[PDB]
Coordinates of C-alpha atoms in Angstrom, one line a residue:
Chain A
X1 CA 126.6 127.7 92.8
X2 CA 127.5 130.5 90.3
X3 CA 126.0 130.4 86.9
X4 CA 126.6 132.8 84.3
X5 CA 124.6 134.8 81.8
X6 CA 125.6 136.9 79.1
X7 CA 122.7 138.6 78.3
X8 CA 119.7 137.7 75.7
X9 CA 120.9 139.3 72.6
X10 CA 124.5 138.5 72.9
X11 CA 123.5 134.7 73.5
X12 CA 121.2 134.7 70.2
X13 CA 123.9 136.2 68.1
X14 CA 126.1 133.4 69.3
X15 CA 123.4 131.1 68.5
X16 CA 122.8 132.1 65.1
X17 CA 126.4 132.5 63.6
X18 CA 127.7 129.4 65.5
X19 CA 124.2 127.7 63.1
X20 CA 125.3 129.5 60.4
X21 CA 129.2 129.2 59.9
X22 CA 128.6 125.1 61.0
X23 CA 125.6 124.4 59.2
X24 CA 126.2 126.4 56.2
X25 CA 122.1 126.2 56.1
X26 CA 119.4 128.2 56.6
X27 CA 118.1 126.5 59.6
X28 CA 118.2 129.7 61.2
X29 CA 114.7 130.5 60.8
X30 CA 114.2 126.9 61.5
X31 CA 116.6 127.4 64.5
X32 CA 114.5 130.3 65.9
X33 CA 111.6 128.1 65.5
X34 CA 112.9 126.0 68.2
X35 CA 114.0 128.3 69.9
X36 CA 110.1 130.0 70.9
X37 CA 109.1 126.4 71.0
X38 CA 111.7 125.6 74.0
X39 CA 110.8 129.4 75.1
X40 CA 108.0 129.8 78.0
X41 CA 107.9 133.0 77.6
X42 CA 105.8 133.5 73.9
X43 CA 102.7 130.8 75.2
X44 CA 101.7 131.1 71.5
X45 CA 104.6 129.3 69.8
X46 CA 106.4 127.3 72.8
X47 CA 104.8 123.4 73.6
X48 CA 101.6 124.5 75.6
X49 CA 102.1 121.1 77.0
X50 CA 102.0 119.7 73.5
X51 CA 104.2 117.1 72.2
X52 CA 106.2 118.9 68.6
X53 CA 106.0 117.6 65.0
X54 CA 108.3 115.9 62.6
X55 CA 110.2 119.3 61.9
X56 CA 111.5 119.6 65.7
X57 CA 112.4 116.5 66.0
X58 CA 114.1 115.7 62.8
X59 CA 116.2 118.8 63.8
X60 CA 116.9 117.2 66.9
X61 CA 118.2 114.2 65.3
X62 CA 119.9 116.5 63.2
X63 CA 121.9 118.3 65.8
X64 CA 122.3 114.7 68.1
X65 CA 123.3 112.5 65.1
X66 CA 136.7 117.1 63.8
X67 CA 138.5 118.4 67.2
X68 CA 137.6 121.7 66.2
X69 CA 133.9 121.0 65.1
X70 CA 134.0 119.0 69.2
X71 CA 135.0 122.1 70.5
X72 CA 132.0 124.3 68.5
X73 CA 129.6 121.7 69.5
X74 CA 130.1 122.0 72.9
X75 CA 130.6 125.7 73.4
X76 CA 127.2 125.3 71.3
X77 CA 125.5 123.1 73.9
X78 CA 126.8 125.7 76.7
X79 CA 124.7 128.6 74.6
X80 CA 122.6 126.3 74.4
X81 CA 121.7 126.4 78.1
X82 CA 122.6 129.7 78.7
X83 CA 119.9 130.8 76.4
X84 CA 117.2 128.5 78.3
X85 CA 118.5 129.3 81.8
X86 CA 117.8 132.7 81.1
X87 CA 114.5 132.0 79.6
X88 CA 113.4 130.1 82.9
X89 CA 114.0 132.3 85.3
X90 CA 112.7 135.4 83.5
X91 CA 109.5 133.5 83.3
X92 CA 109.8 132.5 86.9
X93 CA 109.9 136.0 87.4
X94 CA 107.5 137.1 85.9
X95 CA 105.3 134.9 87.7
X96 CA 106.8 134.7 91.0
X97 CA 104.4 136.6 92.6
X98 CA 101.7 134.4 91.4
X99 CA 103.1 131.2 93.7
X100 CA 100.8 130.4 96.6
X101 CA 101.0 126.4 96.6
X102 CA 102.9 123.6 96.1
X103 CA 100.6 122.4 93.6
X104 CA 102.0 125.6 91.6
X105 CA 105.6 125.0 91.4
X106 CA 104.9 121.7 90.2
X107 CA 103.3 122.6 87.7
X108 CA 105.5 125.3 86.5
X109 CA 108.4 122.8 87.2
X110 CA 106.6 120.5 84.4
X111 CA 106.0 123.3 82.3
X112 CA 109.9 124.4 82.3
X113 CA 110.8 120.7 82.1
X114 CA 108.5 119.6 78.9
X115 CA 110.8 120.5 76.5
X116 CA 113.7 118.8 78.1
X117 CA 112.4 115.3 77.3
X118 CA 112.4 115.9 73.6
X119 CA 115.5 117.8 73.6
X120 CA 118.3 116.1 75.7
X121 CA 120.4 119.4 76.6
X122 CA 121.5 118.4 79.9
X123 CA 124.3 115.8 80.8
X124 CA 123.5 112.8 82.8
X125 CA 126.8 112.7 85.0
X126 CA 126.2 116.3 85.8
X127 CA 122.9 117.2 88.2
X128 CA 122.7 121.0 86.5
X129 CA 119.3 121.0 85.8
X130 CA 118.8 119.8 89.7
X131 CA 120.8 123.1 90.8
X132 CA 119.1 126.1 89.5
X133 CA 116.1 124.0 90.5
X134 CA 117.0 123.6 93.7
X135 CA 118.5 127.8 93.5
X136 CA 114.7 128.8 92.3
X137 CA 113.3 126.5 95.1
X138 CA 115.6 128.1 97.4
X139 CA 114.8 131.9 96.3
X140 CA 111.3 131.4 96.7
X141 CA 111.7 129.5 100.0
X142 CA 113.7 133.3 101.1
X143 CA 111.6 135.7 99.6
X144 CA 108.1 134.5 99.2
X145 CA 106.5 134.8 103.2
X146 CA 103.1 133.8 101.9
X147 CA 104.5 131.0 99.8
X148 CA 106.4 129.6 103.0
X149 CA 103.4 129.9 105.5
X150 CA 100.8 128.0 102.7
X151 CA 104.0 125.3 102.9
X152 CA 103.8 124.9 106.6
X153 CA 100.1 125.0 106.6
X154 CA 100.2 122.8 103.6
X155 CA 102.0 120.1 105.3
X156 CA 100.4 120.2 109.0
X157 CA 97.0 119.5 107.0
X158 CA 98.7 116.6 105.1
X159 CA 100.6 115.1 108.0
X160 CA 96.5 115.3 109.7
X161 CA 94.8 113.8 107.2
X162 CA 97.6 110.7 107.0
X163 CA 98.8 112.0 103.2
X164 CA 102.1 110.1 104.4
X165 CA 103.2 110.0 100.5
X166 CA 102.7 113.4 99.4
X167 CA 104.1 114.9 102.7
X168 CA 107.4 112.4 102.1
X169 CA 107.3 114.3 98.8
X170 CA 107.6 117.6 100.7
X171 CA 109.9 116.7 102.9
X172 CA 112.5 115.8 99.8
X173 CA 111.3 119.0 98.3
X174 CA 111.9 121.4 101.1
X175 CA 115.8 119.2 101.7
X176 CA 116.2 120.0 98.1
X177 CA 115.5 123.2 98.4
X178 CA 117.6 124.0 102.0
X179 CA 115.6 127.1 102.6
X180 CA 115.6 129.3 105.8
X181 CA 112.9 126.5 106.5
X182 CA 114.5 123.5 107.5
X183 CA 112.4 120.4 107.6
X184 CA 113.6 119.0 110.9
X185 CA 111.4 122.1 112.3
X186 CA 108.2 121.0 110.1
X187 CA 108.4 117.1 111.1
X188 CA 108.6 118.2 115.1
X189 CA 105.7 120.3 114.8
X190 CA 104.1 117.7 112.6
X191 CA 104.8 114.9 115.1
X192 CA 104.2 117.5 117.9
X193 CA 100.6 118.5 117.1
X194 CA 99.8 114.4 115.7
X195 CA 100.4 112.6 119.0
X196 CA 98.8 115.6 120.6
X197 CA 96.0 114.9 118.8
X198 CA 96.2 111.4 119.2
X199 CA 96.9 111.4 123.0
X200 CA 93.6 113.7 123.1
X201 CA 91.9 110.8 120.8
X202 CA 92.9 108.2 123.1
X203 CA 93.4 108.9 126.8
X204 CA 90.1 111.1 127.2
X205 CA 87.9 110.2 130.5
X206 CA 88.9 106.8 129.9
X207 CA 90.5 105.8 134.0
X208 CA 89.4 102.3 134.5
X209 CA 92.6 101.0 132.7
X210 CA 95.9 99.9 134.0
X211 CA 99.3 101.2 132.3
X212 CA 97.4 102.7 129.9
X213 CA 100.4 105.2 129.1
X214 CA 102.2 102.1 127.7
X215 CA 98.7 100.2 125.7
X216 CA 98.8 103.9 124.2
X217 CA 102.4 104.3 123.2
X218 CA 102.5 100.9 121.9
X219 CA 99.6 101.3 120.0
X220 CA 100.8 104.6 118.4
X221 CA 104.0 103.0 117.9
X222 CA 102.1 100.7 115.4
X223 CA 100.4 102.8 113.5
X224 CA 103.1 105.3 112.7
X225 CA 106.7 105.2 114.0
X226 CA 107.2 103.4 110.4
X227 CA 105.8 105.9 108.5
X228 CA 107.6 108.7 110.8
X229 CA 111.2 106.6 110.6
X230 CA 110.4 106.7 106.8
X231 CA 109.7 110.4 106.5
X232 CA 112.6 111.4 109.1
X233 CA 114.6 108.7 107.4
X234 CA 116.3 107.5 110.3
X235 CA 116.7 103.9 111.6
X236 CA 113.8 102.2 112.8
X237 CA 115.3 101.5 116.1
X238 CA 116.6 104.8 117.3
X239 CA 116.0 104.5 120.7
X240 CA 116.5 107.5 122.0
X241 CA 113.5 109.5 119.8
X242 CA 111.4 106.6 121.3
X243 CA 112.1 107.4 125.0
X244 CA 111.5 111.2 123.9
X245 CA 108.3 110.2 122.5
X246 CA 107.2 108.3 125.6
X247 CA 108.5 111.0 127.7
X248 CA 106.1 113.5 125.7
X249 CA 103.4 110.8 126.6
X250 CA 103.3 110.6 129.7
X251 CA 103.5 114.4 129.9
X252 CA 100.4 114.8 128.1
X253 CA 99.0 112.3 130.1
X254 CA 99.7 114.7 133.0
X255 CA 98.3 117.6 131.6
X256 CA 95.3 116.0 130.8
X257 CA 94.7 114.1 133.8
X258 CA 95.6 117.5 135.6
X259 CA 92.4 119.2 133.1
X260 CA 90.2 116.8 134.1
X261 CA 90.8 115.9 138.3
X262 CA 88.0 117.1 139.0
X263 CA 85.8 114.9 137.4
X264 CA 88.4 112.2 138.3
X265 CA 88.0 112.6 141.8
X266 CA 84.5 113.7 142.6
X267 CA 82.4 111.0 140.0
X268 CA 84.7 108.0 138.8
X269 CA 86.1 107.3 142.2
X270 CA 86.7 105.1 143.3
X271 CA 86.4 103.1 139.8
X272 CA 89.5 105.7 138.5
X273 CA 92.0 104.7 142.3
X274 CA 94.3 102.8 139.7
X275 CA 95.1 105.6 137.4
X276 CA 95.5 108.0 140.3
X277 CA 98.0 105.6 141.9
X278 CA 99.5 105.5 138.0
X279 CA 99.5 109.3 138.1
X280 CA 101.4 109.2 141.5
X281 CA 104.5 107.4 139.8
X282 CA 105.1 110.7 137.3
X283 CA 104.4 113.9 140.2
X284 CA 107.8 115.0 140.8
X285 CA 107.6 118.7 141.0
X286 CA 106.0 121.3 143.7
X287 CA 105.0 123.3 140.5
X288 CA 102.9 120.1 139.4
X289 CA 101.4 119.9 143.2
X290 CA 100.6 123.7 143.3
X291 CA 98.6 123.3 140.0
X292 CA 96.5 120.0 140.5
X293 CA 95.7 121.6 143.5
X294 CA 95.0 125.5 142.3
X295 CA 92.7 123.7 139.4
X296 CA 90.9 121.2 142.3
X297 CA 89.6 124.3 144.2
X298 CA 89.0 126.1 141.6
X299 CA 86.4 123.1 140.0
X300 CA 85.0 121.9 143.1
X301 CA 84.3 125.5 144.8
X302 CA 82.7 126.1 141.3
X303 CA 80.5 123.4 141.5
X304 CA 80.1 122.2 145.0
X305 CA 80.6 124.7 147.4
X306 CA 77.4 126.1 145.5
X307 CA 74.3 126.7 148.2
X308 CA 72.2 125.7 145.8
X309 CA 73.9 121.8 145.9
X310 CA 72.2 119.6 148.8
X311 CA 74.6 120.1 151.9
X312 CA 74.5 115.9 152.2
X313 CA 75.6 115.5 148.3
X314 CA 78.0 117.8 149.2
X315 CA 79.8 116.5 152.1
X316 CA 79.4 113.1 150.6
X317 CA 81.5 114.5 147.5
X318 CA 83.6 116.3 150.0
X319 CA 84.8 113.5 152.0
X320 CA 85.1 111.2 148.1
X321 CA 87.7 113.6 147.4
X322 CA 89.0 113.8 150.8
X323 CA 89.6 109.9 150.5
X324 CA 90.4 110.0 147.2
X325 CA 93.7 112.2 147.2
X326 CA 94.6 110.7 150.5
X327 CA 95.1 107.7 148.6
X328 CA 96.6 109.5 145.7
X329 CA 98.9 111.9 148.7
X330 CA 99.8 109.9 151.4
X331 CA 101.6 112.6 153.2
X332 CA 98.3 114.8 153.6
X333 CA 99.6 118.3 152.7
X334 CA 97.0 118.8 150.0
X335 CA 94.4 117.6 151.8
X336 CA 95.5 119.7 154.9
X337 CA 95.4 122.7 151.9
X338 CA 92.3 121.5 150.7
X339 CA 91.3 121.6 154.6
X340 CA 92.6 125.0 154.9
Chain B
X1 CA 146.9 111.5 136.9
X2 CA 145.0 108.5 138.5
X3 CA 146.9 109.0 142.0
X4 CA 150.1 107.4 140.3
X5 CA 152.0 108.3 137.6
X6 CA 150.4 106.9 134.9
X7 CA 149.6 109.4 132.2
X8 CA 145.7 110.0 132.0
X9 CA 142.1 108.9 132.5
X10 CA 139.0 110.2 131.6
X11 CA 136.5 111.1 134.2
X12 CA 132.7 112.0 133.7
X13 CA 131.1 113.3 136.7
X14 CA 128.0 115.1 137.4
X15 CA 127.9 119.5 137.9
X16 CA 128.1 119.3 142.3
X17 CA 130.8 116.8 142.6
X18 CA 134.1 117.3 144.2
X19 CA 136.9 116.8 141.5
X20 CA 140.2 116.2 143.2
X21 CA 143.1 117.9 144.6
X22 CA 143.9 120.9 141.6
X23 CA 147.3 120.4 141.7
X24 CA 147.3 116.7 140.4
X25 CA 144.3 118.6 137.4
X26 CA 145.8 118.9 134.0
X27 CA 142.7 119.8 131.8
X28 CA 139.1 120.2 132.4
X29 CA 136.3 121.2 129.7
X30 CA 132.4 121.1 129.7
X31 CA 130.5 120.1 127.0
X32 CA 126.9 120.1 126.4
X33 CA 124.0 120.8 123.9
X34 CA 123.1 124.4 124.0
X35 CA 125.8 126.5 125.8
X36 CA 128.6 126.6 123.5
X37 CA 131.8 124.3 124.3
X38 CA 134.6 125.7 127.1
X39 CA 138.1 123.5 127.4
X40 CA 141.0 124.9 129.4
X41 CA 144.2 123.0 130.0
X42 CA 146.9 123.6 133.3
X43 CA 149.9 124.1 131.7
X44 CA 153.2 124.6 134.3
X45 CA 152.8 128.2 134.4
X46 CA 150.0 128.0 136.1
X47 CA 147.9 125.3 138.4
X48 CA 144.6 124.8 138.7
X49 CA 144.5 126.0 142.8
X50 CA 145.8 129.7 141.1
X51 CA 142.8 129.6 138.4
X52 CA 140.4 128.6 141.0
X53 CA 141.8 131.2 144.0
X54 CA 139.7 133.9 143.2
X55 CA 136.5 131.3 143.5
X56 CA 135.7 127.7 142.9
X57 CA 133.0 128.7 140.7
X58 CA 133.3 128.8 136.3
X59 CA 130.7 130.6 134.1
X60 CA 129.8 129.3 130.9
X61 CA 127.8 131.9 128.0
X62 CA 124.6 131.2 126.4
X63 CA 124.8 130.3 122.9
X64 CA 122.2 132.5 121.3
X65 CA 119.0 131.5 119.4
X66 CA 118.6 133.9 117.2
X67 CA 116.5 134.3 114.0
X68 CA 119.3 136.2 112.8
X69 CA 121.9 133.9 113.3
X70 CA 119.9 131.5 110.9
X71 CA 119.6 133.9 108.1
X72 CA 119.3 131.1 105.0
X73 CA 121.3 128.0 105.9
X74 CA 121.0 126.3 109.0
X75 CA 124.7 125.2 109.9
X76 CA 123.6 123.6 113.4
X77 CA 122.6 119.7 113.3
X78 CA 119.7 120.5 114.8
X79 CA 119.7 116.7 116.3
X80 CA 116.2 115.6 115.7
X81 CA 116.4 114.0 119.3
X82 CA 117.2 117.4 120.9
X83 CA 115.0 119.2 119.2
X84 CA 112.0 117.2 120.5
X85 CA 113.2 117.8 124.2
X86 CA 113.2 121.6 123.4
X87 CA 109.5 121.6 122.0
X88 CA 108.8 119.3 124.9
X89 CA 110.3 122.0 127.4
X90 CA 108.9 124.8 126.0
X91 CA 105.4 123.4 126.0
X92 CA 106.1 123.0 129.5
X93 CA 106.1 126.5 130.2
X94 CA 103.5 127.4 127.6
X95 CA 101.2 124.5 129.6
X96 CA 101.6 126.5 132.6
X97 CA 101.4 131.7 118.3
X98 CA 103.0 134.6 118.0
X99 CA 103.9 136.1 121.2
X100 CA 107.6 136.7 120.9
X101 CA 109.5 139.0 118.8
X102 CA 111.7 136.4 116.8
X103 CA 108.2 135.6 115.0
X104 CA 107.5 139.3 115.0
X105 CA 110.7 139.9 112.9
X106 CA 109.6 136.4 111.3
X107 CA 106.3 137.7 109.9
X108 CA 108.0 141.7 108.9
X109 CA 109.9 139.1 106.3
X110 CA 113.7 141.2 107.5
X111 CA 115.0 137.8 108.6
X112 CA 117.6 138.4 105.6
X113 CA 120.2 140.7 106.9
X114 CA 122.1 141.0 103.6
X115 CA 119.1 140.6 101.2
X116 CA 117.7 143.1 102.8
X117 CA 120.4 145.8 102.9
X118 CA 121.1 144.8 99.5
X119 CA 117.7 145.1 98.4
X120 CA 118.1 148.6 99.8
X121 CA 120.9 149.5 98.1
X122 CA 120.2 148.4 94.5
X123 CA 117.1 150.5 94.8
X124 CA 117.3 153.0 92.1
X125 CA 122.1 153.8 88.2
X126 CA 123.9 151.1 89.5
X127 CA 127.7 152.7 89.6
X128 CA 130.8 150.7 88.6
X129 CA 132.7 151.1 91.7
X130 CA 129.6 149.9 93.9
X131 CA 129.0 147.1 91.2
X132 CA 132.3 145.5 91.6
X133 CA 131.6 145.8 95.4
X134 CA 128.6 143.8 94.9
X135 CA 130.2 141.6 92.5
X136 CA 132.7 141.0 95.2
X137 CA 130.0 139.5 97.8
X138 CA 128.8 137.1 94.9
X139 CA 131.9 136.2 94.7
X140 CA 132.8 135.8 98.5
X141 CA 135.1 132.5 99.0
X142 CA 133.1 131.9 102.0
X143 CA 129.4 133.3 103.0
X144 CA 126.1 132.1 103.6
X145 CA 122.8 133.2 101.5
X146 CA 125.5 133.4 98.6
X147 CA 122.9 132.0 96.0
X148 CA 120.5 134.5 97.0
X149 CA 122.5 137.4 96.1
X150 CA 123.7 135.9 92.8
X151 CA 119.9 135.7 91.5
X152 CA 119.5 138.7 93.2
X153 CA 121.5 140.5 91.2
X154 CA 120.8 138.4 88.2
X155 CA 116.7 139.9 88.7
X156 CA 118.2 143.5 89.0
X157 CA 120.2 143.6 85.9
X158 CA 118.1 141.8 83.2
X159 CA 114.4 141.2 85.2
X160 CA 111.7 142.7 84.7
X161 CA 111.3 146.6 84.9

């Protein structure tokens, strides 16, 4: 993506002799009029967002109604956009440390691209415009930290809230832009932290139900797999992000029902057997025994092995818990560890 | 070879299996996502009993996930699928931030190793035999942050000052 430039002064003295020798008018002046207006840099005589008057456009017209004259116009149109891809990004530049939000190169993207619908400059079969845009993007996406961390926190807040259309809109931005900050990165977090969120919403406390794992990873496939398939973009039935999702599922379902054993096993039980004969279908690993364990003791010897606690509520507790990993262990090594 | 002499057929097994007799082994290769591809072929010269004499045992190197590797452009896949497992596996340990260096050299903003030493070096004079150095990595025929340099450049000679 290599653009040239061949310097302000050299550009305008192009311009106005290429005006004057074709023209054979004094639309110079006229010509440098348009010139400001098309120019971000002076905010006193460029658009301020402000549609122009007859004279601008009638010039327009003028210059957008023989091989030789061809050739002139066109090396014209390339000074043309020389001299306004040099305007740009020495106003970019000047402002570049002045981005913070998205909201801000929007805006600015508006600003530079106001003039354009009045003046067609740029061909349709060629996406130049879309380059330097996606070049600027880019830079910023590389040198800007602050920029790039309000992006991710910009986006984590809008995939929270359910902004579905606006973070679509930063997805295609930040592809665009393909910055050091891919957004396959952004939409794993995204997902990541939302059916954390969700799992934390939904599965709380709540032990009385049966196959719950799959009534919650249906109903979260319901409410959003479309919308995630749409902002991904990939087919609707890939299978294989679904069994990753479940997967993640019924890992969170672990760690959660690992938090909150305790309670599990001294109060709810035996109202909360099925779940813990549900949670005996996913323990596969000595690490996962070692902690339901280490985190069992360390609740129960925290609450119950208190002196203060009735010694007959305590026992009765004792031997719940006793029962209830029994049924949950059949072998009996955590209960003899328990014991121990 | 199938036992006979017909010419080939693929076979997938799992990593503890016992692959047959070496001598009747033309090719093996191991492919998987992370640790970078390894495929070696038995020619005549030698068998795979001769590789396989000093052990029975092949090590593989770890592909590297490094913040320098991805300076500006990403050229892995980065398979959406995959990447799900490793956030899924890493919250696995981190179940049982900005606690490792790759997000300490993230936040210094020196993820850039040629921005930076660029950067560096335009500091200031600009001399013609550097310049047409410089001008030669805008001009590479194949880099990465190639863009980056180019506006780069671009801000050094006619930005602001």
């Amino acid at each position: 993506q290599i653009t040239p430039t061949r310097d302000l002064k050299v550009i305008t003295d192009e311009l106005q002799t290429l005006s004057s020798y074709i023209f054979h008018t004094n639309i110079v002046d006229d010509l440098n009029s348009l010139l400001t207006w098309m120019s971000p840099n002076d905010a006193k005589s460029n658009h301020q967002l402000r549609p122009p008057s007859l004279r601008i456009k009638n010039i327009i017209k003028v210059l957008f109604p023989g091989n030789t004259n061809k050739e002139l116009q066109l090396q014209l149109f390339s000074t043309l956009k020389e001299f306004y891809i040099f305007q740009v990004r020495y106003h970019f530049f000047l402002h570049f440390n002045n981005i913070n939000y998205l909201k801000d190169i929007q805006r600015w993207e508006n600003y530079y691209e106001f003039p354009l619908r009045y003046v067609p400059i740029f061909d349709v079969n060629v996406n130049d415009w879309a380059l330097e845009l996606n070049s600027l993007r880019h830079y910023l996406l590389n040198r800007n930290i602050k920029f790039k961390n309000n992006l991710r926190t910009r986006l984590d807040k809008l995939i929270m809230d359910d902004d579905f259309d606006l973070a679509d809109n930063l997805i295609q931005w930040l592809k665009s832009a393909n910055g050091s900050l891919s957004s396959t990165e952004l939409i794993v977090n995204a997902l990541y932290s939302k059916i954390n969120k969700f799992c934390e919403d939904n599965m709380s406390r709540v032990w009385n139900k049966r196959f719950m794992i799959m009534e919650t990873f249906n109903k979260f496939i319901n409410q959003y797999w479309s919308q995630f398939s749409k902002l991904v973009g990939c087919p609707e039935d890939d299978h294989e992000l679904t069994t990753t999702v479940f997967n993640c599922f019924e890992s969170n379902f672990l760690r959660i029902r690992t938090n909150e054993i305790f309670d599990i096993c001294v109060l709810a039980y035996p109202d909360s057997k099925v779940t813990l004969l549900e949670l005996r279908k996913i323990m596969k690993d000595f690490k996962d025994y070692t902690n339901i364990v280490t985190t069992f003791l360390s609740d129960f010897k925290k609450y119950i092995l208190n002196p203060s606690v009735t010694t007959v509520d305590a026992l009765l507790r004792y031997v719940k818990t006793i029962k209830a990993f029994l049924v949950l262990d059949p072998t009996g090594r955590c209960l003899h560890s328990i014991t121990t | 070879e199938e036992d006979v002499e017909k010419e080939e057929v693929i076979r997938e097994i799992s990593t503890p299996c016992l692959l047959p007799d070496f001598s009747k082994i033309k090719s093996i290769r191991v492919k998987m996502h992370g640790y970078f591809p390894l495929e070696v072929n038995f020619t005549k010269d030698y068998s795979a009993s001769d590789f396989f004499s000093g052990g029975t045992i092949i090590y593989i190197q770890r592909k590297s996930e490094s913040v320098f590797e991805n300076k500006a452009s990403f050229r892995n896949v980065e398979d959406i699928h995959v990447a799900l497992k490793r956030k899924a596996a890493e919250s696995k340990n981190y179940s049982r931030g900005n606690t490792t260096s790759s997000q300490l050299v993230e936040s210094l903003g020196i993820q850039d190793l040629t921005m930076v030493e660029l950067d560096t070096l335009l500091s200031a004079a600009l001399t013609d035999s550097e310049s047409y150095n410089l001008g030669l990595l805008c001009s590479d025929k194949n880099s990465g942050d190639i863009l980056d340099c180019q506006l780069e450049l671009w801000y050094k000679s006619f930005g602001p000052h």
